[PDB]
């Protein structure tokens, strides 16, 4: 039973292709298909700063067809599913605030050097 | 059916021309060239010749080098085996 809240996956289709994303809820299987609520890094931090380091993280919280997400060994466990829900995200507004909260949650981890595999870009050689 | 009783099956076009030996030889080469071969990947009989030596499987969308008139030539089949036996032996 691979699909579980706390699975890091690689998005493979859509504008978020190649990005690393974490499943916060496994949406119940339904006629639409098997889907999950995925929150992940749309854009990585930034470049030079001073020397290498002496600058923002963007996140996408979208529902995505599991077929479009490739499962990986990583985890990134966070409570997460307290704010991210099915009524939210579908809601215009609330999702934007949820994205804002995830963006802050992610930056705290990157500055504190937590979950580096999730926060590194998948190299797609052409 | 059997519109051509003898082996003038693909060589009916040449009509009464070029001699029996040329037409017999052309039967074998022509039938081989326009035949469908099985792609070593698609595993579907969809490989057809594009040019001399170039064969493409319409479903697998993969082009492979081959004999001018057959996807696989007898000398090549033997060479692949000799290279495999020698390779396995070296390791």
């Amino acid at each position: 039973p691979i699909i579980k809240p706390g699975l890091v996956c690689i998005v493979l289709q859509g504008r978020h292709a190649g990005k690393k994303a974490v499943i916060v809820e496994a949406l119940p299987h339904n006629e639409r298909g098997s889907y999950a609520i995925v929150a992940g890094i749309a854009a990585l931090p930034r470049r030079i700063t001073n020397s290498m380091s002496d600058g923002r993280v963007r996140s996408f919280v979208k529902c995505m067809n599991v077929n479009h997400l490739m499962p990986t060994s990583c985890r990134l466990e966070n409570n997460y599913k307290d704010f991210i829900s099915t009524q939210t995200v579908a809601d215009v507004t609330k999702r934007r605030e949820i994205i804002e909260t995830v963006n802050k949650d992610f930056q705290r981890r990157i500055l504190e050097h937590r979950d580096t595999w999730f926060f590194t870009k998948l190299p797609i050689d052409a | 059916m059997a519109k051509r009783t003898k082996k003038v099956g693909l060589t009916g076009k040449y009509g009464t021309r070029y001699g029996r030996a040329a037409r017999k030889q052309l039967l074998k080469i022509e039938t081989s060239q326009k035949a469908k071969y099985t792609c070593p990947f698609c595993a579907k009989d969809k490989v057809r010749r594009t040019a001399c030596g170039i064969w493409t499987c319409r479903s697998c969308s993969k082009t492979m080098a081959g004999g001018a008139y057959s996807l696989h030539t007898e000398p090549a089949n033997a060479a692949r085996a000799t290279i495999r036996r020698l390779r396995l032996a070296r390791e």
């Binding site: - | 040019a51 170039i54 492979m64 080098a65 001018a68 008139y69 696989h72 090549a76 692949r80 070296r90």
Partner: protein
């Protein structure tokens, strides 16, 4: 007399190769530091057709070792190579069809093609459709490897010389009869003005040494000495023997 066709041919000018629309010079990848130690991995982007060559060619893209881009090589294609294959050119390369390894590394009895006459010559022997060379023996003291050229002649080449594993594709191209003069014109148009051919006994005395009399005859023997003069060498040059025979 008049300059004969052979003499007129060496100035090019109408007899020059019809090289327009030919992909390029098919050559083995250049020897590089990563080839000499370890192996470079390339991917066969395409298998295409050269205008004057029966054997299919192949665009294999290798990484640029010198810099940051990707470099494209044109190779005569061994049979069995496919688009999206991974071809390794190196001293440490596995014995699979397509890979280029030095002849000392190649084991004896292996069918090889696009063999280098001398190391770093980027291609020389066994380049036509179906043709191959075989590794016969390696002298590890003289760093030399005997190979049998497609002719049968045995050549001792440096063990350093590289070769592509496999038999060139396009095999059995001459088995099909040309059948019509028209099929010949199409083959030669992609090559050079050498066809159609008029026999010298058909030409007048000025045009050819075989020339012409009341009946079409070669006159003196067709056999000519190796030390003939440039417009005199016209029939069988330095023939050891002539005539159809057993074996």
């Amino acid at each position: 007399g008049r300059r004969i066709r052979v003499q007129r041919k060496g100035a090019g000018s109408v007899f020059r190769a019809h090289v327009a629309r030919r992909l390029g010079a098919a050559k083995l990848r250049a020897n590089d530091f990563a080839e000499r130690t370890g192996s470079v991995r390339g991917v066969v982007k395409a298998i295409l057709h050269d205008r004057g060559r029966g054997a299919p060619l192949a665009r294999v893209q290798f990484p640029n070792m010198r810099g940051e881009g990707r470099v494209n090589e044109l190779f005569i294609a061994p049979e069995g190579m496919y688009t999206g294959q991974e071809v390794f050119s190196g001293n440490k390369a596995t014995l699979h069809i397509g890979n280029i390894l030095p002849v000392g590394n190649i084991p004896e009895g292996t069918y090889v093609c696009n063999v280098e006459e001398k190391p770093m010559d980027r291609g020389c022997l066994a380049r036509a459709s179906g043709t191959y060379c075989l590794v016969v023996a390696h002298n590890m003291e003289t760093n030399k490897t005997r190979i049998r050229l497609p002719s049968g002649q045995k050549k001792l080449i440096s063990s350093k010389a590289r070769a592509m594993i496999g038999l060139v594709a396009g095999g059995g191209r001459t088995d099909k009869p040309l059948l019509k003069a028209g099929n010949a014109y199409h083959k030669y148009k992609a090559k050079r003005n050498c066809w159609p051919v008029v026999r010298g006994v058909a030409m007048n005395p000025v045009d050819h040494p075989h020339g012409g009399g009341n009946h079409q005859h070669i006159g003196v023997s067709s056999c000519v000495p190796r030390n003939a003069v440039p417009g005199q060498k016209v029939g069988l040059i330095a023939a050891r023997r002539t005539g159809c025979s057993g074996g």
